[PDB]
Protein backbone atom coordinates (compact mmCIF):
# COMPACT_ATOMS: atom_id res chain seq x y z
CA UNK A 1 0.00 0.00 0.00
CA UNK A 2 3.05 2.21 0.46
CA UNK A 3 4.11 4.55 -2.35
CA UNK A 4 7.87 4.61 -2.88
CA UNK A 5 9.00 8.13 -3.73
CA UNK A 6 10.66 8.30 -7.14
CA UNK A 7 11.00 11.93 -6.07
CA UNK A 8 14.55 12.13 -4.76
CA UNK A 9 15.53 9.91 -7.69
CA UNK A 10 13.98 12.14 -10.39
CA UNK A 11 12.84 15.36 -8.69
CA UNK A 12 16.37 16.12 -7.49
CA UNK A 13 17.83 19.62 -7.72
CA UNK A 14 21.39 18.31 -8.21
CA UNK A 15 22.33 14.94 -9.68
CA UNK A 16 25.70 13.41 -8.86
CA UNK A 17 28.61 13.15 -11.27
CA UNK A 18 28.88 10.09 -13.49
CA UNK A 19 32.04 8.87 -11.74
CA UNK A 20 30.14 9.14 -8.44
CA UNK A 21 26.78 7.89 -9.72
CA UNK A 22 24.20 7.97 -6.94
CA UNK A 23 22.83 4.57 -5.90
CA UNK A 24 19.44 4.21 -4.20
CA UNK A 25 17.43 1.20 -3.05
CA UNK A 26 13.64 1.03 -3.33
CA UNK A 27 11.60 -1.50 -1.37
CA UNK A 28 8.13 -2.19 0.03
CA UNK A 29 6.00 0.02 -2.17
CA UNK A 30 3.26 0.09 -4.79
CA UNK A 31 5.60 1.18 -7.58
CA UNK A 32 3.08 2.95 -9.82
CA UNK A 33 5.63 3.89 -12.46
CA UNK A 34 2.78 5.01 -14.73
CA UNK A 35 3.94 8.59 -14.20
CA UNK A 36 7.24 7.71 -15.87
CA UNK A 37 5.72 7.20 -19.32
CA UNK A 38 4.99 10.88 -19.89
CA UNK A 39 5.50 12.98 -16.73
CA UNK A 40 8.70 14.35 -18.27
CA UNK A 41 8.81 13.36 -21.98
CA UNK A 42 12.25 11.79 -21.80
CA UNK A 43 14.48 11.85 -24.86
CA UNK A 44 15.49 8.22 -24.25
CA UNK A 45 13.38 5.64 -22.42
CA UNK A 46 14.38 2.11 -23.38
CA UNK A 47 13.79 -1.18 -21.57
CA UNK A 48 15.64 -4.44 -22.18
CA UNK A 49 14.39 -7.24 -19.95
CA UNK A 50 10.71 -6.30 -20.26
CA UNK A 51 8.51 -3.99 -22.29
CA UNK A 52 7.66 -0.83 -20.31
CA UNK A 53 3.93 -1.50 -20.65
CA UNK A 54 4.11 -4.95 -19.04
CA UNK A 55 6.09 -3.62 -16.06
CA UNK A 56 2.85 -2.98 -14.16
CA UNK A 57 2.28 -6.75 -13.84
CA UNK A 58 5.67 -7.84 -12.46
CA UNK A 59 6.67 -8.00 -8.79
CA UNK A 60 10.32 -7.58 -7.81
CA UNK A 61 12.51 -8.38 -4.82
CA UNK A 62 14.96 -5.46 -5.06
CA UNK A 63 15.03 -2.23 -7.07
CA UNK A 64 18.14 -0.09 -7.51
CA UNK A 65 18.14 3.36 -9.11
CA UNK A 66 21.33 4.95 -10.45
CA UNK A 67 21.23 8.69 -11.05
CA UNK A 68 23.95 10.76 -12.71
CA UNK A 69 24.64 13.26 -15.52
CA UNK A 70 26.59 12.53 -18.71
CA UNK A 71 27.51 14.26 -21.94
CA UNK A 72 24.77 14.26 -24.56
CA UNK A 73 26.16 12.12 -27.38
CA UNK A 74 27.42 9.74 -24.67
CA UNK A 75 23.93 8.55 -23.70
CA UNK A 76 24.30 5.53 -26.00
CA UNK A 77 27.19 4.44 -23.77
CA UNK A 78 24.70 3.53 -21.05
CA UNK A 79 23.37 0.53 -22.99
CA UNK A 80 24.92 -2.81 -22.01
CA UNK A 81 27.79 -4.16 -24.07
CA UNK A 82 29.21 -0.78 -25.09
CA UNK A 83 32.70 0.71 -25.01
CA UNK A 84 34.15 4.15 -24.39
CA UNK A 85 35.19 6.43 -21.57
CA UNK A 86 31.78 6.57 -19.87
CA UNK A 87 31.00 2.88 -20.36
CA UNK A 88 34.47 1.63 -19.36
CA UNK A 89 36.03 4.02 -16.84
CA UNK A 90 33.26 5.19 -14.49
CA UNK A 91 30.07 3.20 -15.21
CA UNK A 92 29.40 -0.25 -16.71
CA UNK A 93 26.29 -2.42 -17.05
CA UNK A 94 26.25 -6.23 -17.19
CA UNK A 95 25.57 -8.04 -20.44
CA UNK A 96 22.50 -9.72 -18.91
CA UNK A 97 21.32 -6.40 -17.48
CA UNK A 98 17.63 -6.16 -16.62
CA UNK A 99 15.75 -3.08 -15.57
CA UNK A 100 16.00 -0.16 -17.96
CA UNK A 101 17.33 3.25 -18.84
CA UNK A 102 15.80 6.73 -18.79
CA UNK A 103 17.65 9.82 -20.00
CA UNK A 104 16.48 13.37 -20.61
CA UNK A 105 18.10 16.62 -21.65
CA UNK A 106 18.90 18.99 -18.79
CA UNK A 107 20.67 21.91 -20.44
CA UNK A 108 18.73 24.54 -18.48
CA UNK A 109 19.21 22.90 -15.08
CA UNK A 110 22.87 21.90 -15.23
CA UNK A 111 24.61 24.22 -17.69
CA UNK A 112 26.21 27.41 -16.38
CA UNK A 113 27.09 30.50 -18.41
CA UNK A 114 30.69 30.44 -17.22
CA UNK A 115 30.89 26.66 -17.55
CA UNK A 116 29.60 24.26 -14.92
CA UNK A 117 32.17 22.62 -12.66
CA UNK A 118 30.20 20.41 -10.26
CA UNK A 119 29.96 17.56 -12.77
CA UNK A 120 33.13 15.48 -13.18
CA UNK A 121 34.14 12.33 -15.03
CA UNK A 122 37.05 9.90 -14.91
CA UNK A 123 39.22 10.08 -18.03
CA UNK A 124 42.24 8.06 -16.82
CA UNK A 125 41.89 4.64 -15.19
CA UNK A 126 44.15 1.63 -14.64
CA UNK A 127 41.68 -0.88 -16.11
CA UNK A 128 38.01 -1.34 -16.91
CA UNK A 129 35.61 -1.78 -14.00
CA UNK A 130 33.15 -4.60 -13.38
CA UNK A 131 29.42 -3.94 -13.86
CA UNK A 132 27.76 -1.85 -11.14
CA UNK A 133 31.12 -0.87 -9.62
CA UNK A 134 31.77 2.61 -8.23
CA UNK A 135 35.23 4.16 -7.88
CA UNK A 136 35.83 7.49 -6.14
CA UNK A 137 39.58 7.44 -5.46
CA UNK A 138 41.45 10.39 -6.96
CA UNK A 139 45.10 9.36 -7.04
CA UNK A 140 47.11 10.25 -10.13
CA UNK A 141 47.23 7.73 -12.99
CA UNK A 142 49.66 7.33 -15.88
CA UNK A 143 54.53 10.63 -11.07
CA UNK A 144 54.22 12.26 -7.66
CA UNK A 145 52.05 15.03 -6.29
CA UNK A 146 49.23 15.87 -8.70
CA UNK A 147 50.76 16.79 -12.07
CA UNK A 148 53.58 15.83 -14.39
CA UNK A 149 54.48 14.14 -17.65
CA UNK A 150 51.96 11.27 -17.97
CA UNK A 151 51.08 12.19 -14.36
CA UNK A 152 47.63 13.48 -15.26
CA UNK A 153 44.74 14.22 -12.93
CA UNK A 154 42.12 11.46 -13.35
CA UNK A 155 39.00 13.64 -13.09
CA UNK A 156 37.90 16.38 -15.48
CA UNK A 157 34.76 18.51 -15.56
CA UNK A 158 32.58 19.08 -18.60
CA UNK A 159 32.49 22.70 -19.70
CA UNK A 160 28.71 22.68 -19.60
CA UNK A 161 27.96 26.03 -21.19
CA UNK A 162 24.39 26.65 -22.41
CA UNK A 163 25.67 27.65 -25.86
CA UNK A 164 27.04 24.13 -26.43
CA UNK A 165 25.33 22.40 -29.33
CA UNK A 166 23.23 19.26 -29.06
CA UNK A 167 25.51 16.36 -28.19
CA UNK A 168 27.33 18.47 -25.60
CA UNK A 169 24.39 19.58 -23.46
CA UNK A 170 24.24 17.67 -20.15
CA UNK A 171 21.80 14.76 -20.01
CA UNK A 172 20.39 13.42 -16.75
CA UNK A 173 20.27 9.62 -16.64
CA UNK A 174 18.38 7.31 -14.26
CA UNK A 175 18.85 3.55 -14.59
CA UNK A 176 16.59 1.04 -12.84
CA UNK A 177 17.65 -2.52 -12.04
CA UNK A 178 15.42 -5.23 -10.58
CA UNK A 179 15.36 -9.02 -10.37
CA UNK A 180 12.44 -11.09 -11.66
CA UNK A 181 10.67 -13.85 -9.75
CA UNK A 182 13.03 -15.76 -7.51
CA UNK A 183 12.32 -14.38 -4.01
CA UNK A 184 9.38 -13.06 -1.93
CA UNK A 185 8.07 -10.05 -3.82
CA UNK A 186 8.87 -6.58 -2.51
CA UNK A 187 8.16 -3.95 -5.22
CA UNK A 188 5.39 -3.83 -7.83
CA UNK A 189 2.43 -1.81 -9.04
CA UNK A 190 -1.18 -1.88 -7.88
CA UNK A 191 -2.57 -4.99 -9.63
CA UNK A 192 -5.41 -4.72 -7.12
CA UNK A 193 -5.85 -8.17 -5.59
CA UNK A 194 -9.28 -9.81 -5.57
CA UNK A 195 -10.82 -12.54 -3.43
CA UNK A 196 -9.15 -15.95 -3.57
CA UNK A 197 -11.13 -18.93 -4.88
CA UNK A 198 -10.35 -22.54 -3.98
CA UNK A 199 -11.17 -25.88 -5.62
CA UNK A 200 -12.07 -24.38 -9.01
CA UNK A 201 -10.23 -24.13 -12.33
CA UNK A 202 -9.23 -20.46 -12.50
CA UNK A 203 -6.30 -18.38 -13.68
CA UNK A 204 -4.09 -16.94 -10.96
CA UNK A 205 -1.42 -14.27 -10.57
CA UNK A 206 0.58 -14.39 -7.32
CA UNK A 207 3.44 -11.89 -6.99
CA UNK A 208 3.89 -11.95 -10.76
CA UNK A 209 3.83 -15.75 -11.03
CA UNK A 210 1.01 -16.40 -13.50
CA UNK A 211 -0.73 -19.67 -14.22
CA UNK A 212 -3.99 -21.59 -14.50
CA UNK A 213 -5.25 -24.45 -12.37
CA UNK A 214 -7.14 -25.53 -9.27
CA UNK A 215 -6.04 -24.20 -5.87
CA UNK A 216 -6.28 -26.52 -2.87
CA UNK A 217 -5.25 -26.55 0.77
CA UNK A 218 -1.90 -28.21 1.41
CA UNK A 219 -0.07 -29.62 4.42
CA UNK A 220 3.46 -28.86 3.18
CA UNK A 221 5.55 -26.86 5.66
CA UNK A 222 7.70 -24.23 3.96
CA UNK A 223 10.31 -22.14 5.74
CA UNK A 224 9.60 -18.49 6.63
CA UNK A 225 11.45 -17.26 3.53
CA UNK A 226 10.17 -20.02 1.24
CA UNK A 227 7.59 -18.87 -1.31
CA UNK A 228 7.39 -21.27 -4.27
CA UNK A 229 7.07 -25.04 -4.46
CA UNK A 230 8.59 -27.08 -7.26
CA UNK A 231 8.70 -30.67 -8.50
CA UNK A 232 11.26 -32.77 -10.32
CA UNK A 233 9.70 -31.32 -13.50
CA UNK A 234 10.54 -27.79 -12.22
CA UNK A 235 6.89 -26.72 -12.39
CA UNK A 236 5.19 -24.55 -9.77
CA UNK A 237 3.43 -26.84 -7.29
CA UNK A 238 2.64 -24.77 -4.18
CA UNK A 239 2.62 -21.03 -3.51
CA UNK A 240 2.01 -18.94 -0.41
CA UNK A 241 -0.63 -16.23 -0.53
CA UNK A 242 1.11 -12.84 -0.09
CA UNK A 243 -1.80 -11.19 1.75
CA UNK A 244 -2.51 -13.92 4.31
CA UNK A 245 0.14 -16.52 5.08
CA UNK A 246 -1.02 -19.99 4.04
CA UNK A 247 0.19 -22.48 1.45
CA UNK A 248 -1.90 -23.53 -1.55
CA UNK A 249 -1.24 -26.40 -3.96
CA UNK A 250 -1.92 -25.98 -7.67
CA UNK A 251 -3.30 -28.86 -9.73
CA UNK A 252 -3.56 -28.69 -13.54
CA UNK A 253 -7.11 -28.86 -14.86
Amino acid at each position, epitope marked *: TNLCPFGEVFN*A*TRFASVYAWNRKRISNCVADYSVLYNSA*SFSTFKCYGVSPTKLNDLCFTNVYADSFVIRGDEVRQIAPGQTGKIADYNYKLPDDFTGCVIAWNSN*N*LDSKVGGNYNYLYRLFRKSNLKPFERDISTEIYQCNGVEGFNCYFPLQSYGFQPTNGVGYQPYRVVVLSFELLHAPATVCGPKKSTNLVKNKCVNFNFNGLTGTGVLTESNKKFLPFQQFGRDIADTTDAVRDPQTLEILDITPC
Partner: antibody
Amino acid sequence: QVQLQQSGAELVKPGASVKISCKASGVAFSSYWMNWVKQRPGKGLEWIGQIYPGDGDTNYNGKFKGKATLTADKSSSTAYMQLSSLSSEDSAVYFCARGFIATVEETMDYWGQGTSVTVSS
Amino acid sequence: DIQMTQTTSSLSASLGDRVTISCRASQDISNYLNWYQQKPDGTVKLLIYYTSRLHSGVPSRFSGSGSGTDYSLTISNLEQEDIATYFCQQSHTLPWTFGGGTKLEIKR
Protein backbone atom coordinates in the same frame (compact mmCIF):
# COMPACT_ATOMS: atom_id res chain seq x y z
CA GLN B 1 3.88 23.53 7.17
CA VAL B 2 6.18 24.80 4.42
CA GLN B 3 6.59 28.45 5.42
CA LEU B 4 9.05 31.04 4.09
CA GLN B 5 9.01 33.98 6.50
CA GLN B 6 10.92 37.22 5.90
CA SER B 7 11.74 40.30 7.96
CA GLY B 8 9.63 43.46 8.07
CA ALA B 9 9.79 46.60 5.97
CA GLU B 10 13.13 48.42 5.82
CA LEU B 11 13.85 52.15 5.72
CA VAL B 12 17.36 52.70 4.36
CA LYS B 13 19.30 55.89 3.74
CA PRO B 14 20.76 56.05 0.21
CA GLY B 15 24.22 54.56 -0.15
CA ALA B 16 23.88 52.24 2.86
CA SER B 17 23.68 48.43 2.98
CA VAL B 18 20.72 46.33 4.13
CA LYS B 19 20.34 42.67 5.12
CA ILE B 20 17.16 40.64 4.52
CA SER B 21 16.64 37.18 6.01
CA CYS B 22 14.33 34.52 4.55
CA LYS B 23 13.81 31.60 6.94
CA ALA B 24 12.32 28.29 5.81
CA SER B 25 10.30 26.03 8.11
CA GLY B 26 9.16 22.55 7.15
CA VAL B 27 11.58 22.39 4.21
CA ALA B 28 14.86 20.65 3.52
CA PHE B 29 16.33 24.12 3.08
CA SER B 30 19.80 22.83 2.21
CA SER B 31 18.65 20.75 -0.79
CA TYR B 32 16.70 23.26 -2.91
CA TRP B 33 17.59 26.52 -4.61
CA MET B 34 16.56 29.83 -3.05
CA ASN B 35 15.55 32.31 -5.75
CA TRP B 36 15.36 36.01 -4.88
CA VAL B 37 13.05 38.18 -7.00
CA LYS B 38 12.48 41.95 -7.11
CA GLN B 39 9.16 43.66 -7.83
CA ARG B 40 8.83 47.39 -8.35
CA PRO B 41 5.25 48.64 -7.89
CA GLY B 42 3.42 48.51 -11.20
CA LYS B 43 6.37 46.83 -12.94
CA GLY B 44 7.00 43.20 -13.78
CA LEU B 45 8.86 40.69 -11.65
CA GLU B 46 12.65 40.65 -11.98
CA TRP B 47 14.68 37.56 -11.13
CA ILE B 48 17.50 38.89 -8.96
CA GLY B 49 19.46 35.78 -8.14
CA GLN B 50 19.61 32.28 -6.77
CA ILE B 51 21.68 30.37 -4.21
CA TYR B 52 22.15 26.71 -3.28
CA PRO B 53 22.54 26.33 0.50
CA GLY B 54 23.99 22.84 0.10
CA ASP B 55 27.37 24.07 -1.11
CA GLY B 56 26.98 27.82 -1.70
CA ASP B 57 26.50 27.58 -5.49
CA THR B 58 25.13 30.93 -6.71
CA ASN B 59 23.73 32.22 -10.00
CA TYR B 60 23.33 35.99 -10.31
CA ASN B 61 21.40 37.98 -12.89
CA GLY B 62 23.56 40.20 -15.07
CA LYS B 63 21.80 43.40 -14.02
CA PHE B 64 22.09 42.64 -10.30
CA LYS B 65 25.54 41.03 -10.43
CA GLY B 66 27.72 42.37 -7.63
CA LYS B 67 25.02 44.71 -6.36
CA ALA B 68 23.31 41.97 -4.31
CA THR B 69 25.07 39.25 -2.32
CA LEU B 70 23.47 35.95 -1.32
CA THR B 71 24.59 33.84 1.64
CA ALA B 72 23.24 30.70 3.29
CA ASP B 73 22.80 29.69 6.94
CA LYS B 74 22.47 25.92 7.29
CA SER B 75 22.05 25.90 11.07
CA SER B 76 19.09 28.29 11.21
CA SER B 77 18.09 27.41 7.62
CA THR B 78 17.98 31.01 6.43
CA ALA B 79 19.00 32.76 3.21
CA TYR B 80 20.55 36.20 3.71
CA MET B 81 20.51 38.91 1.05
CA GLN B 82 22.82 41.91 1.33
CA LEU B 83 22.20 45.05 -0.72
CA SER B 84 24.95 47.64 -1.14
CA SER B 85 25.08 51.11 -2.71
CA LEU B 86 21.34 51.61 -2.35
CA SER B 87 19.57 54.22 -4.46
CA SER B 88 15.97 55.39 -4.66
CA GLU B 89 15.10 53.00 -7.50
CA ASP B 90 15.94 49.97 -5.35
CA SER B 91 12.78 50.63 -3.32
CA ALA B 92 10.77 47.50 -4.09
CA VAL B 93 9.30 44.28 -2.70
CA TYR B 94 11.71 41.34 -2.53
CA PHE B 95 10.53 37.72 -2.53
CA CYS B 96 12.30 34.48 -1.68
CA ALA B 97 11.10 31.30 -3.38
CA ARG B 98 12.04 27.63 -3.50
CA GLY B 99 13.39 26.20 -6.74
CA PHE B 100 11.79 22.78 -7.00
CA ILE B 101 12.66 20.55 -9.96
CA ALA B 102 9.93 18.93 -12.04
CA THR B 103 12.58 16.59 -13.55
CA VAL B 104 12.63 18.80 -16.65
CA GLU B 105 12.72 22.33 -15.27
CA GLU B 106 12.94 24.49 -12.16
CA THR B 107 9.86 26.18 -10.71
CA MET B 108 9.45 28.58 -7.78
CA ASP B 109 6.70 26.68 -5.98
CA TYR B 110 6.66 28.19 -2.47
CA TRP B 111 7.04 31.95 -2.05
CA GLY B 112 7.72 34.13 0.96
CA GLN B 113 5.52 36.92 2.24
CA GLY B 114 7.73 39.57 0.62
CA THR B 115 9.90 42.26 2.22
CA SER B 116 9.23 45.90 1.36
CA VAL B 117 12.44 47.95 1.23
CA THR B 118 12.39 51.72 0.73
CA VAL B 119 15.49 53.85 0.16
CA SER B 120 15.17 57.51 1.16
CA SER B 121 16.40 60.23 3.54
CA ASP C 1 18.15 36.72 -22.08
CA ILE C 2 14.78 35.36 -23.18
CA GLN C 3 12.30 38.19 -23.73
CA MET C 4 8.92 37.39 -22.16
CA THR C 5 5.86 39.35 -23.26
CA GLN C 6 2.18 39.28 -22.35
CA THR C 7 0.09 40.90 -25.07
CA THR C 8 -2.80 41.95 -22.81
CA SER C 9 -1.67 44.14 -19.92
CA SER C 10 -5.14 43.96 -18.34
CA LEU C 11 -8.58 42.63 -19.18
CA SER C 12 -12.11 42.70 -17.77
CA ALA C 13 -14.31 39.61 -17.59
CA SER C 14 -17.50 38.38 -15.96
CA LEU C 15 -17.97 35.59 -13.44
CA GLY C 16 -17.92 32.01 -14.70
CA ASP C 17 -16.67 32.80 -18.21
CA ARG C 18 -13.62 31.24 -19.83
CA VAL C 19 -10.69 33.66 -19.77
CA THR C 20 -7.54 33.22 -21.86
CA ILE C 21 -4.25 34.93 -21.00
CA SER C 22 -1.57 34.72 -23.68
CA CYS C 23 2.21 34.65 -23.30
CA ARG C 24 4.65 35.05 -26.21
CA ALA C 25 8.38 34.35 -25.96
CA SER C 26 11.12 35.71 -28.20
CA GLN C 27 12.93 32.36 -28.42
CA ASP C 28 11.56 28.83 -28.38
CA ILE C 29 11.48 27.48 -24.83
CA SER C 30 9.85 24.10 -25.59
CA ASN C 31 7.19 24.00 -22.82
CA TYR C 32 9.44 25.34 -20.05
CA LEU C 33 6.92 27.88 -18.79
CA ASN C 34 5.40 28.42 -15.35
CA TRP C 35 2.25 30.38 -14.50
CA TYR C 36 2.21 32.17 -11.15
CA GLN C 37 -0.71 33.99 -9.53
CA GLN C 38 -0.31 36.98 -7.19
CA LYS C 39 -3.23 38.13 -5.06
CA PRO C 40 -3.93 41.87 -4.78
CA ASP C 41 -2.66 41.80 -1.19
CA GLY C 42 0.75 40.72 -2.52
CA THR C 43 0.62 36.98 -1.83
CA VAL C 44 1.92 34.98 -4.81
CA LYS C 45 1.78 31.23 -5.40
CA LEU C 46 2.60 28.83 -8.21
CA LEU C 47 -0.35 27.92 -10.42
CA ILE C 48 0.85 25.86 -13.41
CA TYR C 49 4.19 24.33 -14.33
CA TYR C 50 5.48 22.82 -17.58
CA THR C 51 2.51 24.58 -19.28
CA SER C 52 0.02 21.78 -18.48
CA ARG C 53 0.67 20.35 -15.00
CA LEU C 54 -1.81 21.55 -12.38
CA HIS C 55 -0.09 22.41 -9.11
CA SER C 56 -1.16 20.81 -5.84
CA GLY C 57 -4.16 22.44 -4.19
CA VAL C 58 -5.05 24.45 -7.31
CA PRO C 59 -8.69 24.18 -8.49
CA SER C 60 -9.18 22.24 -11.71
CA ARG C 61 -10.90 25.22 -13.37
CA PHE C 62 -7.44 26.46 -14.39
CA SER C 63 -5.62 24.97 -17.36
CA GLY C 64 -2.64 25.64 -19.59
CA SER C 65 -1.79 25.06 -23.23
CA GLY C 66 0.53 26.13 -26.02
CA SER C 67 3.87 25.26 -27.56
CA GLY C 68 6.81 26.74 -29.42
CA THR C 69 6.88 30.42 -28.47
CA ASP C 70 3.20 30.96 -27.61
CA TYR C 71 1.30 29.67 -24.58
CA SER C 72 -1.97 30.46 -22.86
CA LEU C 73 -3.66 29.99 -19.49
CA THR C 74 -7.40 29.34 -19.51
CA ILE C 75 -9.93 29.77 -16.71
CA SER C 76 -12.94 27.58 -17.47
CA ASN C 77 -15.22 29.38 -14.99
CA LEU C 78 -14.02 32.63 -13.44
CA GLU C 79 -14.70 32.92 -9.71
CA GLN C 80 -14.37 35.80 -7.26
CA GLU C 81 -11.06 34.78 -5.68
CA ASP C 82 -9.51 34.17 -9.12
CA ILE C 83 -9.14 37.96 -9.53
CA ALA C 84 -5.37 38.44 -9.30
CA THR C 85 -2.30 39.08 -11.47
CA TYR C 86 -0.91 36.23 -13.58
CA PHE C 87 2.74 36.01 -14.61
CA CYS C 88 4.36 33.65 -17.11
CA GLN C 89 8.01 32.84 -16.41
CA GLN C 90 10.40 30.91 -18.64
CA SER C 91 13.06 28.43 -17.56
CA HIS C 92 14.90 27.73 -20.83
CA THR C 93 17.97 29.87 -20.09
CA LEU C 94 19.51 30.74 -16.73
CA PRO C 95 18.53 34.47 -16.65
CA TRP C 96 14.86 33.69 -16.05
CA THR C 97 12.39 36.44 -16.90
CA PHE C 98 8.78 37.08 -15.93
CA GLY C 99 5.99 38.47 -18.07
CA GLY C 100 4.42 41.87 -17.65
CA GLY C 101 1.52 40.42 -15.68
CA THR C 102 -2.20 40.50 -16.49
CA LYS C 103 -4.84 41.89 -14.13
CA LEU C 104 -8.49 40.84 -14.27
CA GLU C 105 -11.46 43.13 -13.66
CA ILE C 106 -15.25 42.89 -13.67
CA LYS C 107 -17.23 44.29 -16.61
CA ARG C 108 -18.03 47.78 -15.30
